[PDB]
Design an enzyme around this catalytic site. Structure first.
Site, PDB file in Angstrom:
ATOM      1  N   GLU A  55      37.446  29.672  39.110  1.00 23.58           N
ATOM      2  CA  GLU A  55      37.772  30.896  39.280  1.00 23.58           C
ATOM      3  C   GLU A  55      39.182  31.443  39.180  1.00 23.58           C
ATOM      4  O   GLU A  55      39.668  32.505  38.478  1.00 23.58           O
ATOM      5  CB  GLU A  55      36.891  31.451  40.586  1.00 23.58           C
ATOM      6  CG  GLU A  55      35.482  31.445  40.591  1.00 23.58           C
ATOM      7  CD  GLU A  55      34.651  31.671  41.839  1.00 23.58           C
ATOM      8  OE1 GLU A  55      35.233  31.372  43.098  1.00 23.58           O
ATOM      9  OE2 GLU A  55      33.605  31.884  41.778  1.00 23.58           O
ATOM     10  N   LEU A  56      39.838  30.687  40.096  1.00 22.00           N
ATOM     11  CA  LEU A  56      41.282  31.075  40.075  1.00 22.00           C
ATOM     12  C   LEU A  56      42.363  31.129  38.787  1.00 22.00           C
ATOM     13  O   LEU A  56      43.210  31.868  38.485  1.00 22.00           O
ATOM     14  CB  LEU A  56      42.164  30.817  41.539  1.00 22.00           C
ATOM     15  CG  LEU A  56      41.497  31.143  42.647  1.00 22.00           C
ATOM     16  CD1 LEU A  56      41.977  30.189  43.856  1.00 22.00           C
ATOM     17  CD2 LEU A  56      41.790  32.598  42.981  1.00 22.00           C
TER      18      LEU A  56
END
Lengths: 138, 139
Positions: free
Chosen positions: B76-77
């Site tokens: 996600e990051l």
């Protein structure tokens, strides 16, 4: 006579202060801090004086809780200027603070050399303080 | 309806840095969207960023302890920070009242990624950087 004291506002005691003290102790240094807490009213110069009489260096945690005590420029400029044994002995560390907050509450610190926990891990800070201690006391 | 920037943030930061940055950008002539970009556990970072970029040129993300302690995954990051639109990176992380140790503990993939940092950069410094970037790509 010991190696470091850590002056701090109470809000920082159980977190960065305790963690930094632990890491320094795990690196052979003697470090104390509890009686160097700054409460509203306390005298910054007296606290630093008590510390530098017993220890080689003072670490001061520059957090919002610290700067919002509204220390005066003289109090702050004198703190960072302290010298002992022929070298600087007060080591400011910015912690969970904005530059804008420093400029509002403690602008004389904005340009003074400091470590910064957003840039430096505890390990990085310990390595820097070690190098300084080695360069001065061997 | 188009905006220049959207600001993704944890709720803890809304009334402080988010409002202050939005106010300064707006005073300097930029249109800023942030009321729909409070982030909470269970939100999809990818879908939130998709939505912001559907009507804004750049996303700013406030990397504070409240943000990182939502435990975003590395995929996600990495996907957030690598997001490109029209051939350039469009997500602008700003570290805020955070320690490097907290970044390494809760969001380690961010530790080496380019970011502004409110302990180093005043809001005016941030605005100047964003003004130069936005002008280069959108004048």
């Amino acid at each position: 006579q010991y190696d470091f004291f850590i002056s701090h506002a109470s809000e920082d005691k159980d977190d960065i202060v305790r963690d930094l003290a632990e890491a320094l102790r795990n690196n052979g240094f003697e470090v104390w801090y509890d009686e160097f807490e700054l409460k509203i009213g306390d005298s910054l110069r007296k606290k630093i004086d008590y510390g530098l009489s017993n220890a080689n260096y003072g670490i001061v945690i520059i957090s919002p809780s610290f700067v919002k005590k509204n220390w005066t420029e003289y109090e702050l400029n004198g703190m960072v200027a302290r010298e002992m044994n022929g070298h600087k002995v007060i080591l400011p560390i910015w912690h969970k603070i904005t530059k804008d907050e420093v400029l509002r509450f403690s602008p004389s610190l904005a340009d003074k050399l400091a470590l910064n926990t957003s840039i430096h891990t505890i390990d990085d800070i310990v390595e820097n303080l070690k190098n300084l201690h080695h360069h001065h006391h061997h």
